[PDB]
PDB file of N, CA and C in Angstrom:
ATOM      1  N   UNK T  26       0.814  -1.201   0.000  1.00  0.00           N
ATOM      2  CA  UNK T  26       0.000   0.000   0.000  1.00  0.00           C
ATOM      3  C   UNK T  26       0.854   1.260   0.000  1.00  0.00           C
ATOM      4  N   UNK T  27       0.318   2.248  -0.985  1.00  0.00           N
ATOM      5  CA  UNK T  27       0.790   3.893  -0.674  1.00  0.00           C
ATOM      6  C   UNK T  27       0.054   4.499   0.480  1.00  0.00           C
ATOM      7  N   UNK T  28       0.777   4.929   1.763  1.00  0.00           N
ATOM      8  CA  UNK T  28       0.439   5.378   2.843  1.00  0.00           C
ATOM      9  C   UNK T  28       0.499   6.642   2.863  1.00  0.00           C
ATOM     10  N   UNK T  29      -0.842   7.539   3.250  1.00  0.00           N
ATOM     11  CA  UNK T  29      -0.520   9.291   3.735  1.00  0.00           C
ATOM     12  C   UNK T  29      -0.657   9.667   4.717  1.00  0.00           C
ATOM     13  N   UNK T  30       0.321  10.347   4.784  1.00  0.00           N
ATOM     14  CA  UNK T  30       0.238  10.592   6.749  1.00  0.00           C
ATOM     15  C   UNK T  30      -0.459  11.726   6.611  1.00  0.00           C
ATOM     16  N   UNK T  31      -1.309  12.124   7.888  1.00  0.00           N
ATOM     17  CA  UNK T  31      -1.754  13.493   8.818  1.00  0.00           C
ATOM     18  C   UNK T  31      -1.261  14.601   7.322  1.00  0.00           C
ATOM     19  N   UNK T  32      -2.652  15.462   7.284  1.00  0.00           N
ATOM     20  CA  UNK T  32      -2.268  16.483   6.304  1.00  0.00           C
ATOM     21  C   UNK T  32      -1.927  17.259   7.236  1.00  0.00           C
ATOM     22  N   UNK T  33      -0.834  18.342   6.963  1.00  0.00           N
ATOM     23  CA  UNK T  33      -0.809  19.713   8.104  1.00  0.00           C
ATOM     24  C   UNK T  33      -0.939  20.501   7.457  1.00  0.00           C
ATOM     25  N   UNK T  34      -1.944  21.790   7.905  1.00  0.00           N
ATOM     26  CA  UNK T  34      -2.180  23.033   7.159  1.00  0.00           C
ATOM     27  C   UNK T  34      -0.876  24.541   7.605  1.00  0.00           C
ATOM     28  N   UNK T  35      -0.629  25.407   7.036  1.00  0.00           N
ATOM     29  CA  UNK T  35      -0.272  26.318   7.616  1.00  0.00           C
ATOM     30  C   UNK T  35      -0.800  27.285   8.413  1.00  0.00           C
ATOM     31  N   UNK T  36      -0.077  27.881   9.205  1.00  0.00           N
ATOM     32  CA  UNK T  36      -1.008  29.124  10.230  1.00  0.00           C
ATOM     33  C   UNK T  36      -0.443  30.169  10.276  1.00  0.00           C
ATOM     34  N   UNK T  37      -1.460  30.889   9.188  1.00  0.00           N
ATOM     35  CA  UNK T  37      -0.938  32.124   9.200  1.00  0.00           C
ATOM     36  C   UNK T  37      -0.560  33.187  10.596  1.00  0.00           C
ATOM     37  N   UNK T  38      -0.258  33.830  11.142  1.00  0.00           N
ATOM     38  CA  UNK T  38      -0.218  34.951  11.929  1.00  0.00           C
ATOM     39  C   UNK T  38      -0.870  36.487  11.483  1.00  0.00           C
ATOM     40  N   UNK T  39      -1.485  37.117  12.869  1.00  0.00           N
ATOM     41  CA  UNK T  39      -2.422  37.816  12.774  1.00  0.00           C
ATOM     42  C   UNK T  39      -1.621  39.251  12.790  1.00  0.00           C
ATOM     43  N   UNK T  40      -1.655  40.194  12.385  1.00  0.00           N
ATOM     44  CA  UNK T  40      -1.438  41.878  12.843  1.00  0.00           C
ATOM     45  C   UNK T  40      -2.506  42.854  12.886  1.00  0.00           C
ATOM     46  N   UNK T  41      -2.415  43.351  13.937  1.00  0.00           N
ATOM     47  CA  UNK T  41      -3.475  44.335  13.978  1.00  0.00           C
ATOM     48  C   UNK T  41      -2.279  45.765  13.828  1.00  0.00           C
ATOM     49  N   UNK T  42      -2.525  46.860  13.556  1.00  0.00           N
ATOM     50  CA  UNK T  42      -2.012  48.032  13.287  1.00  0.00           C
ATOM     51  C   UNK T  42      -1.251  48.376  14.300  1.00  0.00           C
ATOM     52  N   UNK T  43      -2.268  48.480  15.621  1.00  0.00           N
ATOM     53  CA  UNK T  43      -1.993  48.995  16.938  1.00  0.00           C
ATOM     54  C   UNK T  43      -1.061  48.296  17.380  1.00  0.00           C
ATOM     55  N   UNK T  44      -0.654  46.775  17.245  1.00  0.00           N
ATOM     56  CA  UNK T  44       0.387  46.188  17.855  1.00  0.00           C
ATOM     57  C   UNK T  44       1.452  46.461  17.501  1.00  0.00           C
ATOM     58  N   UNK T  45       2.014  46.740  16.053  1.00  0.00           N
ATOM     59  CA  UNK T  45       3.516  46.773  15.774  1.00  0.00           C
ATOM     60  C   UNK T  45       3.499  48.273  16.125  1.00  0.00           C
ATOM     61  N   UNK T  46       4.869  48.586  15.755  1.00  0.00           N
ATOM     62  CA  UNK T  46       5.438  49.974  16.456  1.00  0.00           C
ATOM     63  C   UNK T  46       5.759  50.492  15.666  1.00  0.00           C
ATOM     64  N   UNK T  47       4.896  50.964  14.684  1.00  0.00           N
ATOM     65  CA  UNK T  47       4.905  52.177  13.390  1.00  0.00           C
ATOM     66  C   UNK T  47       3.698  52.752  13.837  1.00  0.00           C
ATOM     67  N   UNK T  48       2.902  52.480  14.848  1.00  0.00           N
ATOM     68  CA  UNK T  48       1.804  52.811  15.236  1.00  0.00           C
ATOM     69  C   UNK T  48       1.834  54.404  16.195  1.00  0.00           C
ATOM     70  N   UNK T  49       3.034  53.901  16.662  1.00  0.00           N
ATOM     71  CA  UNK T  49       3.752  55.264  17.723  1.00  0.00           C
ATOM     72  C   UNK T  49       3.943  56.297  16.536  1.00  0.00           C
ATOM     73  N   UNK T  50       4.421  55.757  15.214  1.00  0.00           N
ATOM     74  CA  UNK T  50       4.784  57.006  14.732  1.00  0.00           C
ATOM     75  C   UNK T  50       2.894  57.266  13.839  1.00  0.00           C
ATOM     76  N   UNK T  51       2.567  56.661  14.344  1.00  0.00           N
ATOM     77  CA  UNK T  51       0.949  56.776  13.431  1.00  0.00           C
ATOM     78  C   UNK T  51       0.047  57.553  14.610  1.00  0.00           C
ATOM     79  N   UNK T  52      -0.717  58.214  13.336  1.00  0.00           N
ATOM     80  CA  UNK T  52      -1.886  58.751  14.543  1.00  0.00           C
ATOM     81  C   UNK T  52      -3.404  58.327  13.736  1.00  0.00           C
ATOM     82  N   UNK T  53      -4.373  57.356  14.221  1.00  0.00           N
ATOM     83  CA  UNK T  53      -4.881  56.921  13.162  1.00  0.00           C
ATOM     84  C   UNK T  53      -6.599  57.204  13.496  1.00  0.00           C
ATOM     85  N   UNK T  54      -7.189  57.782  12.802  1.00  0.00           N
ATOM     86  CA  UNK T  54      -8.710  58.587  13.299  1.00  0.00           C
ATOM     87  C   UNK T  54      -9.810  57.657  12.018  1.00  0.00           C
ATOM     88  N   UNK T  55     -10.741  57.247  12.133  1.00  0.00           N
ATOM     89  CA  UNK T  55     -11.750  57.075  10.841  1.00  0.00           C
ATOM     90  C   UNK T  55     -12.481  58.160  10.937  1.00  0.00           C
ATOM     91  N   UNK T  56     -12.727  58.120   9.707  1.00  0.00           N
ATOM     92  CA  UNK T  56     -13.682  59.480   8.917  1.00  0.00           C
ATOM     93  C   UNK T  56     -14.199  58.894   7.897  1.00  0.00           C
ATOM     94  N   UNK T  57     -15.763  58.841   7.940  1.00  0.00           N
ATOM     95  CA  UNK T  57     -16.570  57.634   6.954  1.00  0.00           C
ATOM     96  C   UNK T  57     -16.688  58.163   5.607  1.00  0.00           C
ATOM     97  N   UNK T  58     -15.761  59.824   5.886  1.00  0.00           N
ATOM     98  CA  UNK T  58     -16.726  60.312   3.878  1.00  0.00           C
ATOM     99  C   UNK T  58     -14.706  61.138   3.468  1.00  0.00           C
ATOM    100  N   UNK T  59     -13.533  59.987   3.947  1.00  0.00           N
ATOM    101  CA  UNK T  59     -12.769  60.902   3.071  1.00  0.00           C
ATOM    102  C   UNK T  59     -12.334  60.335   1.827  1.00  0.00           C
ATOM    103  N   UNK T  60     -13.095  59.215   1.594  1.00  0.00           N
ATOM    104  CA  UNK T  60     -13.480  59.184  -0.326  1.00  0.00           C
ATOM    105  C   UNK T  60     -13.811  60.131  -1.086  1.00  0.00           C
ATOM    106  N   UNK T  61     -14.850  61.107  -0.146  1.00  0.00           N
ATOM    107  CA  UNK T  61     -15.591  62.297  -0.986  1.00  0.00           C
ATOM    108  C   UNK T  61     -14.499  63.763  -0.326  1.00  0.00           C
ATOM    109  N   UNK T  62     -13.706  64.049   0.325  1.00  0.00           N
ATOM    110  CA  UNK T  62     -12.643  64.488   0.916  1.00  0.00           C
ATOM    111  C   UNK T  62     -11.651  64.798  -0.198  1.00  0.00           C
ATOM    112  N   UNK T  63     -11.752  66.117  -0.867  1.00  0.00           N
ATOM    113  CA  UNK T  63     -10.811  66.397  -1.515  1.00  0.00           C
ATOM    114  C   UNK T  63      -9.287  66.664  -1.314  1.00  0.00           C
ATOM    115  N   UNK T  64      -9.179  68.077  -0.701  1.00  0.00           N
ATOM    116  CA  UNK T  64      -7.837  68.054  -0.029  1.00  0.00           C
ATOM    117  C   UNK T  64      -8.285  68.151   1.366  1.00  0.00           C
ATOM    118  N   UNK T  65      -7.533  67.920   2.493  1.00  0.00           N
ATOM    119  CA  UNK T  65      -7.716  68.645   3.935  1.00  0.00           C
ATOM    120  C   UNK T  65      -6.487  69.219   3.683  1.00  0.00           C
ATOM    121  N   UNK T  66      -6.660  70.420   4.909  1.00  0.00           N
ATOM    122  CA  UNK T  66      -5.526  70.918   5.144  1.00  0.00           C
ATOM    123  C   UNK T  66      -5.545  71.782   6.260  1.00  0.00           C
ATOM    124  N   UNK T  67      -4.192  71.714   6.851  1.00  0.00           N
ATOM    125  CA  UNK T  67      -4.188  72.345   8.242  1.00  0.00           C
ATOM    126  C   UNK T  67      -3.200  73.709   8.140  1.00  0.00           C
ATOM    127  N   UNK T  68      -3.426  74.860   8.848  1.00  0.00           N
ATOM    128  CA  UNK T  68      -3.270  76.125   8.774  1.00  0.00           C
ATOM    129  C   UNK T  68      -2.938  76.375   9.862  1.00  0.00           C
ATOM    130  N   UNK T  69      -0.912  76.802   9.761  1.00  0.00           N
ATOM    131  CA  UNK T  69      -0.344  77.246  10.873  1.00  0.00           C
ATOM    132  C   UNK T  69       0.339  78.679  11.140  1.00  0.00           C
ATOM    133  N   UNK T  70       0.057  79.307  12.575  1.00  0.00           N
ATOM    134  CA  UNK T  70       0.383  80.656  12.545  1.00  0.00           C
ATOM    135  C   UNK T  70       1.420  81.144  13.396  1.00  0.00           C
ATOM    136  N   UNK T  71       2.461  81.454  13.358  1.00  0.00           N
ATOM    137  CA  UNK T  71       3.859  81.212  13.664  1.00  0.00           C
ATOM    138  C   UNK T  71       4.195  82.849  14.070  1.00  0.00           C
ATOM    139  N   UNK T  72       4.522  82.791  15.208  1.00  0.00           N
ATOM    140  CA  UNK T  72       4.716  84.193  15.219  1.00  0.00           C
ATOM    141  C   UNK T  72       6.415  84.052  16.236  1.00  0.00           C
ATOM    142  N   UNK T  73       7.073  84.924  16.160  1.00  0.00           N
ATOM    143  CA  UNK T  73       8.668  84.462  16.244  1.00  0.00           C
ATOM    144  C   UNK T  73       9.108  85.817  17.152  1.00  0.00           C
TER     145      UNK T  73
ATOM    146  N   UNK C 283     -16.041  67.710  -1.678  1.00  0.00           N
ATOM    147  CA  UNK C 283     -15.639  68.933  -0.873  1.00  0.00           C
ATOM    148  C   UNK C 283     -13.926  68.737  -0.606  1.00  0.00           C
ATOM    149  N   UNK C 284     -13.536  69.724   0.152  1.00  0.00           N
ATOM    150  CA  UNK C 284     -12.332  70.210   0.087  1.00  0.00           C
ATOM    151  C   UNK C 284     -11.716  70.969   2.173  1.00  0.00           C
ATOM    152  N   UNK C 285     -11.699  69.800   2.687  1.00  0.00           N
ATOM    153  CA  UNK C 285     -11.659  69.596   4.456  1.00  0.00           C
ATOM    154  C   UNK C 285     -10.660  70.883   4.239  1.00  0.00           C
ATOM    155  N   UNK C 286     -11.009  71.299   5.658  1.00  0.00           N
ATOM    156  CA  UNK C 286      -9.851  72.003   6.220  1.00  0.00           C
ATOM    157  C   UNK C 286      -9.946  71.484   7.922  1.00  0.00           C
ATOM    158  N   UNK C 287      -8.545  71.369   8.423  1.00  0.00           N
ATOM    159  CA  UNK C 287      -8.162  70.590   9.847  1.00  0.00           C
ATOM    160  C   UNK C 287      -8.470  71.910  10.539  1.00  0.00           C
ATOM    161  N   UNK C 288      -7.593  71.546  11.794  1.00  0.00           N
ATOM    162  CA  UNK C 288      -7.380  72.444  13.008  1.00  0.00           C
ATOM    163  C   UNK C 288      -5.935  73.258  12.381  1.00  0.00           C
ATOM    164  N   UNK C 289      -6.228  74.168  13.032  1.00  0.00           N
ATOM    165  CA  UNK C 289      -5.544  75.716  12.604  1.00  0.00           C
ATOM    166  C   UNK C 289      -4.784  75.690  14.288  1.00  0.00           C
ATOM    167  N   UNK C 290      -3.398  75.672  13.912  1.00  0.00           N
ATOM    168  CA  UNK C 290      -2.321  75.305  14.847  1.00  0.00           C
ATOM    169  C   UNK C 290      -1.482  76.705  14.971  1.00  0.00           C
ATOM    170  N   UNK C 291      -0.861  77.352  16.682  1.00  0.00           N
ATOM    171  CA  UNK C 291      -0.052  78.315  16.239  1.00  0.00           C
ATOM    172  C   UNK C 291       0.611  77.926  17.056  1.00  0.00           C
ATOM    173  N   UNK C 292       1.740  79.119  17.248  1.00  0.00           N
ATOM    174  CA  UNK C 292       3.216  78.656  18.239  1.00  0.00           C
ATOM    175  C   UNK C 292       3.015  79.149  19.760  1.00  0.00           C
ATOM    176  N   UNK C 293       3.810  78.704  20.204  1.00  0.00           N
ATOM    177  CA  UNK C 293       4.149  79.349  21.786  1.00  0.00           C
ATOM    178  C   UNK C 293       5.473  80.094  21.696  1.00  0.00           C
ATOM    179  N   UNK C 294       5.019  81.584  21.998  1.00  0.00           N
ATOM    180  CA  UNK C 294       6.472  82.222  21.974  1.00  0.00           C
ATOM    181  C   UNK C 294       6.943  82.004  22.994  1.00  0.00           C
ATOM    182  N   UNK C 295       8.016  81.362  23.693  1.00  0.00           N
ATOM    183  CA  UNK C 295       8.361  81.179  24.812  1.00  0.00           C
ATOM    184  C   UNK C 295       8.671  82.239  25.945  1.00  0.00           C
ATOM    185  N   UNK C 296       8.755  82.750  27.125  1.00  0.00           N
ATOM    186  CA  UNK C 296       9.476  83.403  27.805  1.00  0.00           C
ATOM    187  C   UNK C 296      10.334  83.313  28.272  1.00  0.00           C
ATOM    188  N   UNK C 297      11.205  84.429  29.291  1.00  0.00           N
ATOM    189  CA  UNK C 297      12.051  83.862  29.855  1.00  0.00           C
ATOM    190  C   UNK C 297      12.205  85.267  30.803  1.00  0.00           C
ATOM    191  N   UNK C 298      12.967  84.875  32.104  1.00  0.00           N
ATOM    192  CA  UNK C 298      13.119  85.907  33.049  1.00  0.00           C
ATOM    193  C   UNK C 298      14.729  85.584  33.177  1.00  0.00           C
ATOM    194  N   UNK C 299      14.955  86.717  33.313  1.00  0.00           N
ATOM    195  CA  UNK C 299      16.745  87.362  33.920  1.00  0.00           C
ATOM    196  C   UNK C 299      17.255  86.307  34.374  1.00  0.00           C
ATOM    197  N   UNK C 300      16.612  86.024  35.921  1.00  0.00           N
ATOM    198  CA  UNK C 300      16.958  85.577  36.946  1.00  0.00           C
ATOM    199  C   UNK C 300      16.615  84.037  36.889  1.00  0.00           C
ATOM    200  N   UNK C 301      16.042  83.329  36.151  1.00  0.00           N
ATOM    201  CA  UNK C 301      16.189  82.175  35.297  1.00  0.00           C
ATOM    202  C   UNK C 301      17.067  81.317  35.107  1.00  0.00           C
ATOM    203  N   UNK C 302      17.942  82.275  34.013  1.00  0.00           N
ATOM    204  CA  UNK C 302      19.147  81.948  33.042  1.00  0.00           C
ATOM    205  C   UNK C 302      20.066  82.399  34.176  1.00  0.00           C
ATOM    206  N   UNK C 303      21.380  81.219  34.173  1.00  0.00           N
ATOM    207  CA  UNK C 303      22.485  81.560  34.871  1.00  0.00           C
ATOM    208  C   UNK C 303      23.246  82.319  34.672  1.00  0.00           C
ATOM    209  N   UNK C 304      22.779  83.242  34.084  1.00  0.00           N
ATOM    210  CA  UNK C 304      23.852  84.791  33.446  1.00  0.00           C
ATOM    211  C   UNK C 304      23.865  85.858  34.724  1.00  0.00           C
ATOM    212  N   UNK C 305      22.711  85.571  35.362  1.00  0.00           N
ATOM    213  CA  UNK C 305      22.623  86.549  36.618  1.00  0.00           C
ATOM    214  C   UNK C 305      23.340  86.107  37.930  1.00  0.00           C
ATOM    215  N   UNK C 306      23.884  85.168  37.554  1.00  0.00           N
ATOM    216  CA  UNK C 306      25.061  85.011  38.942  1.00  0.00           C
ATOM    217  C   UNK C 306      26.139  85.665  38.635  1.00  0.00           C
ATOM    218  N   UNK C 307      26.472  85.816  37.378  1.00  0.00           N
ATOM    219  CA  UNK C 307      27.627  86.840  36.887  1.00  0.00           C
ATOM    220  C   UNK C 307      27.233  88.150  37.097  1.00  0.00           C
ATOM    221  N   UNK C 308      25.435  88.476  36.961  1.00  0.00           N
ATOM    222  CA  UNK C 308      24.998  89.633  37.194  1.00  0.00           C
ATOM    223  C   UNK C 308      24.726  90.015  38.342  1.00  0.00           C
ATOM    224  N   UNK C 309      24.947  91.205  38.815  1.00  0.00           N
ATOM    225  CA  UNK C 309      23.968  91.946  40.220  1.00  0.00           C
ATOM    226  C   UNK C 309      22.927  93.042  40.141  1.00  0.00           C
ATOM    227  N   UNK C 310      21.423  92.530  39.705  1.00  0.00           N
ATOM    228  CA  UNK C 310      20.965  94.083  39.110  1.00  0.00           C
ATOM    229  C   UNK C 310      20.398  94.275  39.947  1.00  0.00           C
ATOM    230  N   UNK C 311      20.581  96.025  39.723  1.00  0.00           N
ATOM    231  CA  UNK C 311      19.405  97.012  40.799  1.00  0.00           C
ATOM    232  C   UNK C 311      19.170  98.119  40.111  1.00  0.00           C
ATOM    233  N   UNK C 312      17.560  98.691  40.188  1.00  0.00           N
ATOM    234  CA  UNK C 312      16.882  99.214  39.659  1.00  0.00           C
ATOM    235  C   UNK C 312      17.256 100.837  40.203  1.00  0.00           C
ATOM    236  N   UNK C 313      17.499 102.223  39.305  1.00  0.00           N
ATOM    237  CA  UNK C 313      17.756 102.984  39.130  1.00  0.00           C
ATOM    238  C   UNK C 313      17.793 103.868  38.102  1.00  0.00           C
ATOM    239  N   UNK C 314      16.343 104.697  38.627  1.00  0.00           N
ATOM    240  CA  UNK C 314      15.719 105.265  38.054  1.00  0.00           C
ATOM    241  C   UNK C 314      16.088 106.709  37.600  1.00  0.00           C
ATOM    242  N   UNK C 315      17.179 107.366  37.308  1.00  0.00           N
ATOM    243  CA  UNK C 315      17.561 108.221  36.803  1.00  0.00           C
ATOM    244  C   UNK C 315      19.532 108.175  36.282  1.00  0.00           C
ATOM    245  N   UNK C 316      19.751 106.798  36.300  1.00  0.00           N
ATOM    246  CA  UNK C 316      20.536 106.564  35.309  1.00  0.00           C
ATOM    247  C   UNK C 316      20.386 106.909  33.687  1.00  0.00           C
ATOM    248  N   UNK C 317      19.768 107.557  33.195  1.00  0.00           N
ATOM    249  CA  UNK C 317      19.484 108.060  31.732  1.00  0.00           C
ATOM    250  C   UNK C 317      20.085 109.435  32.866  1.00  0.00           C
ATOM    251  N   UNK C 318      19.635 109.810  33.730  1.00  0.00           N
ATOM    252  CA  UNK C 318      20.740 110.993  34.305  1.00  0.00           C
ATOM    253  C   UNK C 318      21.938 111.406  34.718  1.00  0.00           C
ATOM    254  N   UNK C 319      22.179 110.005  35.463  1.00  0.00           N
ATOM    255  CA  UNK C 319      24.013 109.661  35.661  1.00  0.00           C
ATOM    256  C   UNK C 319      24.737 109.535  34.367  1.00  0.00           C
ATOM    257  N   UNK C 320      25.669 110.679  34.298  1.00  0.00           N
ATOM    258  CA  UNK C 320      26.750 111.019  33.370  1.00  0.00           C
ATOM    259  C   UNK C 320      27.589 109.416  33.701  1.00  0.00           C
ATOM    260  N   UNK C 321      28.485 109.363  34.630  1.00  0.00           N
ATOM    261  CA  UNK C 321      29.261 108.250  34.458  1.00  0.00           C
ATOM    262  C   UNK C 321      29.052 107.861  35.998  1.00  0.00           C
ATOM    263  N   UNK C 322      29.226 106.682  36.540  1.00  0.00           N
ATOM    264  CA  UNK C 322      28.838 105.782  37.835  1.00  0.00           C
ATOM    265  C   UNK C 322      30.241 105.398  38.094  1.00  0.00           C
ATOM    266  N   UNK C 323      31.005 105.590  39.209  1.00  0.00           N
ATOM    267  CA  UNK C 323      32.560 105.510  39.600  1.00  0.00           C
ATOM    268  C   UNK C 323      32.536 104.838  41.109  1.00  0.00           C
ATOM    269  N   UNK C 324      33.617 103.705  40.793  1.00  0.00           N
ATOM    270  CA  UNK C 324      33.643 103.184  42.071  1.00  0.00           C
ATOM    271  C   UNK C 324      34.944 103.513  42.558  1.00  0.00           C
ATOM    272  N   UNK C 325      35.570 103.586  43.881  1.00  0.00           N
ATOM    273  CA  UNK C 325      36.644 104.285  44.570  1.00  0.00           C
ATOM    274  C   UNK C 325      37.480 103.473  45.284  1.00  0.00           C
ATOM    275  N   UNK C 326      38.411 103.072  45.349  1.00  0.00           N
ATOM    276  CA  UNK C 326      39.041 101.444  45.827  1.00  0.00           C
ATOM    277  C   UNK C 326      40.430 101.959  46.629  1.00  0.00           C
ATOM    278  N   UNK C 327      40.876 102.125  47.657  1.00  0.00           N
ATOM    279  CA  UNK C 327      41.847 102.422  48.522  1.00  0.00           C
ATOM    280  C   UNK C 327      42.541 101.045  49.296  1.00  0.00           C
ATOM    281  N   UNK C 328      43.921 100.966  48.575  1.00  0.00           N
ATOM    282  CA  UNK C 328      44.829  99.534  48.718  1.00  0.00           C
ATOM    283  C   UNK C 328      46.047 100.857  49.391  1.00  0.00           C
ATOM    284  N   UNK C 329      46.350  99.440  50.579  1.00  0.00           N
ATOM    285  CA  UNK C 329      47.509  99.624  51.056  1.00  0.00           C
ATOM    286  C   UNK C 329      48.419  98.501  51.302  1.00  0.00           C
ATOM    287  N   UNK C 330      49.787  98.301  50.876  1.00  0.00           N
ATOM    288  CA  UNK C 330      50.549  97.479  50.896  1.00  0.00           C
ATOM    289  C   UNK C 330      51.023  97.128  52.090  1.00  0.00           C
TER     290      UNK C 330
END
């Protein structure tokens, strides 16, 4: 007889955003309409 | 549409005299008609 042993599958591993540490340099907000969001933009006033 | 963020400005910082370690080299006192004193002379008597 040709015998098959036990199939084994692989297991992938999971990441969520918040766990790795590009997250520190991330600041991460949802906003449900910036598909329709042309430019944003932020306006700074610097006085010296 | 076309977002606009939060509108960000600076902090001009302060700072007082007596703060900064420049005023241990300094001794100030307030004198109010120095725009009147021609020249301010100190008088030093050494004996050997």
């Amino acid at each position: 007889f040709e015998a098959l042993l036990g199939i084994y599958c692989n297991k992938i591993e999971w990441i969520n955003f918040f766990t790795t540490p590009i997250a520190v340099a991330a600041n991460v907000i949802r906003f449900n309409d910036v598909s329709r969001m042309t430019l944003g933009k932020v306006l700074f006033f610097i006085q010296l």
